[PDB]
């Protein structure tokens, strides 16, 4: 019963998830930073938002609080953390429960 999915990540893993999502018939949403304005994954989702127009390099895929805010604004249902950013971050999966967003992991 998932309709809107958001990938909290970039690059190949993100493109991989959208592809699955697509095939499950689930709208996707991608996030990017300032320096990924031109990253391929950016263009593979249905929608795409900039995390932290305020924020920096690879501490932009690490901002729990902003990403959850992007997710809520797109009426997101799940977040798939891919691998090696927030994928193992205990705190992140919790603020996801709180907000109604199913964290796709353990």
């Amino acid at each position: 019963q998932i309709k809107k999915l958001l990938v909290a990540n970039r690059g190949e893993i993100a493109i991989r998830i959208f592809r699955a999502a697509a095939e499950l018939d689930i709208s996707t949403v991608a996030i990017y930073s300032n320096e990924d304005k031109s990253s391929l994954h950016r263009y593979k989702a249905d929608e795409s938002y900039l995390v932290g127009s305020d924020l920096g390099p690879a501490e932009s895929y690490l901002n729990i609080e902003r990403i959850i805010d992007v997710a809520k604004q797109a009426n997101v249902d799940a977040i798939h953390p891919g691998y090696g950013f927030l994928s193992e971050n205990e705190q992140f999966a919790r603020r996801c429960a709180e907000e109604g967003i199913k964290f796709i992991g353990p």
């Binding site: 949403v29 304005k37 031109s38 391929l40 950016r42 263009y43 249905d46 929608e47 795409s48 938002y49 797109a74």
Partner: protein, 562 residues
């Protein structure tokens, strides 16, 4: 300003909802501070930039605006030329502009200028057209229809008024100012007595607010004091005053009205203000320090809006007028808004450039020859056309009647004397009217009563056949009001997409080799486009643009015209 803070504001929109129009009006008369209406999204650019300002420019400040005018009375943001000019030159849906602003700015009344006879269109329409258009208007966010008639003919106002009470929005009824109540020699007709009488009548037709539309900035300082004096005492409607600053005397006029107890004034931010636009709200704000009453607003915010619009104006320098200093001859000829300039882009444009001092004079003379009329749209066009015609044809006041039988008077004037703009205050002179219509009967009744109601249903089937499938009611009255133009809006949209989404500089100039632009299409869907090169034209003049668009090489073919 965050969309969430805005949600938290409760201004005059909220108040309409709470207490209705009846109730909004009363609340106005309560307040002690001068309430203000902003004209930056409408009259101000209509005067200074040929009404070319585009949706995108307004939506970008929508949210800072909703904050700055949190306590203002309304935002005038639709009506006038905007309807026509959006579809036509700008090639964008006025309705989307309204819709989008409405969501961006949820706390402040939206105001538009309704032409009593034909709304927003360009000819006469049967009444069910007026009604449909007002129905859909009020459905989309307008809360205050300022209804004026171009000859102050109360009768032609009754219908648009009836349409407004039906949607339970605010109905602003409009006297247009002419002549000079300070000066007994100027008119036997347009005298303090006329306005008071004419105000009382309007109150009876049940309008909520009485508005004075000084469309040519003719309303001198003392006269505003006098005029607003008597009005505030002959009627219990709140008074809402609109001048232009074309004499240079606008603030002074407003400062005067304020003392007499005006209720709301129309103003513009500094950088969109001045000359043929409204007075500058910034300026008035400080001007009032030290006197009893004060403007209700956020200057520190306004100075900020001013700065925005200062820059955006730049994007439009191609449509600036050449009016660059105030002009007091406007007191002799009473030409409204642009005309003084416009009429000149016309008189050289057929070789009397060296005799415009004659044309401005004939303008004055033709007015009186028409028995001294109120000169707004389109009545101002009629006078303008006669003036041209008569100078061009070595014509005078007596010889228009002698040689009339063998003169092609312009369609604008034959149409006037035919009853088709409506009925002039003083009636028509019989012998002039005769020489002008060469037989043709005149209407005996507002041009409205004469016409089969439109069949809105034959229109849908016509428009649904032609286009896609989904046609709205806005598509319909848009077609009805502007058939030829609306058809064209639709060719373009099909060809080029939704242009209103572009930024003004790209709308007007395109791209330069090397440049990367971004268009926000929908929420989180945007186009990033880079123009890499344009090649050299080929065997038959077809250049090859090299783009990149979203990580994708792309090639477009365009017809050059050497």
């Amino acid at each position: 300003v965050s969309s969430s803070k805005i949600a938290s504001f409760s201004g005059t929109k909220q108040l309409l909802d709470e207490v209705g129009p009846k109730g909004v009006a009363e609340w106005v008369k309560k307040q002690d501070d001068v309430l203000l209406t902003d004209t930056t999204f409408r009259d101000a650019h209509q005067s200074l930039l040929a009404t070319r300002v585009r949706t995108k420019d307004m939506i970008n400040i929508a949210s800072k605006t909703a904050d700055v005018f949190k306590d203002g009375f309304s935002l005038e943001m639709w009506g006038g030329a905007t309807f026509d000019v959006a579809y036509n030159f700008l090639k964008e849906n006025p309705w989307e502009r309204l819709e989008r602003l409405r969501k961006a700015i949820p706390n402040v009344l939206f105001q538009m200028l309704l032409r009593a006879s034909n709304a927003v269109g360009y000819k006469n329409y049967p009444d069910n057209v007026i009604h449909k258009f007002v129905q859909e208007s009020a459905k989309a966010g307008i809360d205050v229809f300022r209804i004026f008639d171009s000859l102050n003919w109360v009768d032609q106002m009754k219908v648009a008024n009836e349409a407004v009470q039906e949607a339970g929005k605010i109905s602003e009824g409009t006297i247009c100012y002419t002549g000079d109540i300070l000066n007994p020699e100027r008119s036997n007709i347009y005298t303090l007595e006329y306005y008071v009488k004419l105000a009382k009548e309007l109150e009876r037709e049940g309008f909520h607010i009485l508005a004075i539309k000084d469309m040519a900035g003719l309303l001198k300082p003392k006269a505003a004091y006098e005029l607003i004096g008597e009005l505030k005492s002959a009627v219990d409607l709140p008074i809402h005053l609109h001048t232009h600053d074309t004499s240079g005397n606008g603030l002074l006029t407003y400062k005067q009205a304020i003392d007499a107890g005006v209720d709301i004034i129309d103003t513009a931010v500094a950088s969109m203000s001045g000359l043929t636009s409204q007075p500058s709200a910034n300026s008035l704000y400080y001007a009032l320090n030290g006197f009893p009453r004060h403007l209700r607003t956020d200057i520190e915010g306004m100075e900020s809006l001013s700065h925005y619009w200062s820059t955006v104006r730049t994007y439009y320098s191609d449509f600036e007028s050449d009016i660059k200093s105030p002009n007091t001859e406007i007191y002799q000829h009473e030409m409204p808004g642009g005309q003084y300039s416009n009429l000149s882009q016309q008189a050289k444009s057929l070789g009397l450039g060296e005799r415009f001092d004659e044309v401005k004079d004939m303008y004055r003379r033709v007015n009186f020859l028409f028995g001294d009329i109120v000169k707004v749209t389109p009545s101002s066009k009629v006078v303008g056309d006669m003036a041209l015609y008569m100078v061009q044809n070595d014509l005078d006041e007596q010889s228009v009647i002698t040689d009339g039988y063998k003169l092609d008077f312009p369609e604008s004037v034959v149409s006037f004397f035919k009853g088709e703009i409506g009925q002039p205050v003083n009636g028509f002179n019989k012998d002039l009217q005769a020489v002008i219509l060469k037989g043709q009967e005149a209407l005996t009744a507002r041009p409205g009563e004469y016409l089969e109601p439109v069949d809105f249903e034959k229109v849908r089937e016509l428009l649904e056949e032609e286009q896609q499938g989904p046609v709205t009611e806005q598509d319909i009255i848009s077609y009805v009001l502007y058939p030829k133009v609306y058809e064209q809006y639709i060719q373009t949209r099909n060809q080029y997409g939704n242009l209103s989404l572009l930024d003004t500089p790209t709308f007007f100039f395109g791209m330069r080799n090397g440049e990367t632009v971004e268009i926000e299409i929908d929420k989180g869907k945007r186009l990033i486009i880079k123009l890499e090169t344009i090649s050299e034209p080929d065997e038959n003049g077809n250049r090859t643009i090299y783009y990149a668009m979203n990580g994708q090489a792309r090639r477009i073919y365009i017809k050059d015209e050497n």
